[PDB]
Design a protein around this ligand. Sequence first.
Ligand code: FDF
Ligand code: FDF
Ligand code: FDF
Ligand code: CL
Ligand code: MG
Ligand code: MG
Lengths: 297, 295, 284, 295
Amino acid sequence: SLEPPPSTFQPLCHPLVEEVSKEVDGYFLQHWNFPNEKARKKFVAAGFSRVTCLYFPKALDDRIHFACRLLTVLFLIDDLLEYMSFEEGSAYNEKLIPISRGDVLPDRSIPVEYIIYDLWESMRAHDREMADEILEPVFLFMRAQTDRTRARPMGLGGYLEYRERDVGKELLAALMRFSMGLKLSPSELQRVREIDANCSKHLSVVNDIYSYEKELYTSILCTSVQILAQEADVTAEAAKRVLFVMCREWELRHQLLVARLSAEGLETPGLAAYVEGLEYQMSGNELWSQTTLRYSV
Amino acid sequence: SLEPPPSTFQPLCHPLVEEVSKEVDGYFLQHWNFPNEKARKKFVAAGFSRVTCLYFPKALDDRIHFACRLLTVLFLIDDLLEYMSFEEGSAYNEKLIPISRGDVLPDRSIPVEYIIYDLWESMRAHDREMADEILEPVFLFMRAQTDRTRARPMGLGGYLEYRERDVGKELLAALMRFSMGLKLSPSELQRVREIDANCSKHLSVVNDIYSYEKELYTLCTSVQILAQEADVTAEAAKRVLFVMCREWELRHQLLVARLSAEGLETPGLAAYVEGLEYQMSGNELWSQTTLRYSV
Amino acid sequence: SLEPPPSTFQPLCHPLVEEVSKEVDGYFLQHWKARKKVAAGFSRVTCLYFPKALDDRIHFACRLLTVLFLIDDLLEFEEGSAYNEKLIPISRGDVLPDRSIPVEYIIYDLWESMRAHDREMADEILEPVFLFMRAQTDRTRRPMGLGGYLEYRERDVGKELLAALMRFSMGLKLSPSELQRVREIDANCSKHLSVVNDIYSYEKELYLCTSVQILAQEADVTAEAAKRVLFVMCREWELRHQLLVARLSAEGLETPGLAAYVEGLEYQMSGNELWSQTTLRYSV
Amino acid sequence: SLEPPPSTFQPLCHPLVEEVSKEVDGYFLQHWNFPNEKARKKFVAAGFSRVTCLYFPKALDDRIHFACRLLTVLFLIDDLLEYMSFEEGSAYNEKLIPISRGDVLPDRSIPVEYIIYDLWESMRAHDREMADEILEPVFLFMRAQTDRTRARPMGLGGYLEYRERDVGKELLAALMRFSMGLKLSPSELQRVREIDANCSKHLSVVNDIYSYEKELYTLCTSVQILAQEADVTAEAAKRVLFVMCREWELRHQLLVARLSAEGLETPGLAAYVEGLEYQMSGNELWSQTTLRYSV
Ligand SMILES: C/C(=C\CC/C(C)=C/COP(=O)(O)OP(=O)(O)O)CCC=C(CF)CF
Ligand SMILES: C/C(=C\CC/C(C)=C/COP(=O)(O)OP(=O)(O)O)CCC=C(CF)CF
Ligand SMILES: C/C(=C\CC/C(C)=C/COP(=O)(O)OP(=O)(O)O)CCC=C(CF)CF
Ligand SMILES: [Cl-]
Ligand SMILES: [Mg+2]
Ligand SMILES: [Mg+2]
């Protein structure tokens, strides 16, 4: 099989993983309109709350659950969208957006509508200012869930630059800041721009490495594995390995940029905690990619 | 510095290296026109025959000197071109091409001319049939020594496919077939087409990796390219490219076995495919030592 | 030899152009060589870009451009990012301008007058403007092919600054729900503006990143030859724009505000062309 | 539908077109094993010798038939290859090569085998020198008919650079020189490198413009690539590309004038570049009329 190269990074989980998993999972099991029982067992087996704790281990104890709820519903909605058309899904989420802003009261008879309205109302209660900060990142993501992918020849360079702007990863960085109470200033973010780009790249390639077998079932393939294999003319497996070393090079560069950021006296306490959180998203994303059933054939 | 990742390929120097060295080196130490003495000293150190012996280890004991000669003169000529222009250089070699075919005569007063003539007459003398096989390969190559790079940005893929056609690595393969008395038939060579590209690509990247510093002083190299596309330092890029070379090495082996499974292959190809394997490991050792890449 | 191919897009000019031009030019030419020329046609471009702008807002746009144009180039130590960055806080009004340095109180007053006419929409242009100003002062690049460049330009900031400034000029209120519906049309439009720009500014910018150089290399033809091919490509995007607008309408997603928005984008393209040809900024 | 933009070039056919066709047709009509009758009917419809007179309208009267025969057999062999695997076809043509060289006699009982042998035996008999001059161009093509295309992300520039090296266009140019009796020296050919690359792109793109739909059933053409990089329809890409083709026609005229103004144009090159012009004009008409692209 495939062996991951040496890494100075290691996966961690949020301390309250078990308590939150129970809480959040419980809520949805009683509120979410699940199809049959096999579905409820498939939901618990997924442990979305646990996935979230693996991504945001350094999240505040009284905030980690918000993230678990947020991602949980996003994962669920993403599954529903699978059985819908771009027109349907687009309209579906576009409706939940005003409900998320809290500018439209939900139809209490529809689960997803009040779960969303409630989740955001709850969030604004805990921290109005920061809760508003993640509104845009979330919608940007939601709208992207139903966007049509334009196919065009892309070399490794173009592909990687494209992933640097991935909205899913942008959502994770903004959600992580919320779960950690990190209110970074405009100057501080523009200060870690390279770090973010590098990280977003890491997360994506790691996903490509383990999601390849899945996507290669085409019964519109956009992945670094495919691109690196054709450009270097090697097998997909050969490309996966090469891509993995590249990822370690991005971990190194991360440490370099973090050292540079500090050496220049620009590492405020927040950025310190932030760039650390990012290190855990990278290691967390890797363990997840290696186990999640989403990538299972 | 840079630590090369594990390889199952091992270099090998041709046994007669030391003798063919004294021989060939001498031939040029009296015939070729060297400026002063410093030129000669350096020349000795460069050890072109040694370099050749590292690339063609399995070369027939009574043919290894030919190669050492062919590459010593090209290495020599190439060096002179660094002081000539695209018009001057293109003609310089363009003039030597006919004489090489034997269709023209070598002005005996002109070192380089009779050496090339004598060199070839000698080769057709040993093996007329094969001494010709490497006429075009050498020419197509000589003319390439004076071309002007075109203006089009290349990505990793474009650069690699481009290196799969490298005229130089093509010359090597041909000069090796000659040094090993391997008369491959057209149907065979094509059967190893992918094997030639994968190899040429391998030789070029290893070269890039060790020649980066040198070239960097003013660029078409896999190091700068991957460094820009992946957005990492040149060093990080070298490490990645090196691992990539190991994949090409593993691929080579597969291209070799696959060649026999779907129909075992003649001793010629079987031998040739092995010769290619030695150029790869040979080139690596060279790249790590040749002063050509030193500052 | 540059004979623009046929186009169905007809450029419009704001009827108050003459009025506002002298009005606006007469301003900076008081609060700012022996030359100063004008011949550039700043307020003139604005009027070609936003011909449907509201009569009482058209001068605002001319001022924001007459200043942004005197900055993009003109006054611009290849990292004088401190110059621009020192004008953002002022723009928001969080810092007062030294009545001595024109470029300062010009920005201040300018923005203060924009909020006073309409705060909401005035604040909305802030970010789009800063993003433009923050953009390009040198931070660019890796290997760029045609497709990469056009894709890069589909998300151009200046092109984003125009749509922003345009909505403010016409008093067009659009929700992200509606803007999201016109992403394709925006990307397409942004390309048209950038390539036309590249075609006529090739000489000036050459005195680099431009579709003219790239196509010339990839097709291996001269710059002028590339300009002609690029022009035909612009006519295709014009056709695509119409098709996209047709679709927006049929898909029942067209709303009055959106109907005006698209048509306005058409004006920027046609206007951008007429201008680029005449403007002595690229030495006609 | 698709209206071709203005052009200063015009298609031209060879005068002996009617006689050559008759001659070349009858020959194959009796020596070539046509499955039934439906085939012979189709065969005549193709007008292979008529296609040749369109591409080489300036061919010598006593040579144009050599071209028609050559293309006809290649066309036919291309069709039979469609019913063979890569390994099959590769071995099929790999056998006709040693035969074309005249090095191995044909099995007179197998049509394709003795039709090739005799053809080359004939050509050498008319101009041994030039005949051998085009052996490699033909073999380079034949071996490409059974090649596996390596798919990789490719932009416009990459695709065009690749087409400049198209073996088919190389064959037409080589075959054209043979048909026109133009023995170009190495210096002359090197002198028209750009011109050949420019023309090679032109023929290749015009083909793509008209073979798109055909290939658009259930991969590697300038149409799909430009449409995707510019985000326009394939139909629009075709209109843009056509204009580009006129630009290349312009480039051709300017390269000839410069090549002339620099005193580098010879009587042979003059006839050659004009021959390429008609190759571009002819290829365009063919692309619009051949049934090879229909449905
Ligand atoms: C992005 C996250 C939550 C967003 C909610 C959802 C449904 C994310 C899943 O969207 P994608 O995974 O990007 O499409 P994909 O499966 O890759 O073809 C946290 C981690 C999820 C990942 C999914 F890839 C990876 F980090
Ligand atoms: C195929 C030959 C040698 C193989 C060893 C190699 C890779 C020689 C390298 O030839 P170069 O194109 O100049 O790359 P470089 O920047 O000098 O390292 C013949 C020697 C030819 C020369 C001129 F081509 C001498 F450099
Ligand atoms: C270049 C030649 C003729 C010019 C007519 C042309 C442009 C034929 C081109 O047919 P293609 O659509 O390019 O598919 P191909 O890969 O060439 O089989 C002689 C080669 C003979 C053929 C017969 F099979 C090739 F098409
Ligand atoms: Cl030209
Ligand atoms: Mg500018
Ligand atoms: Mg410009």
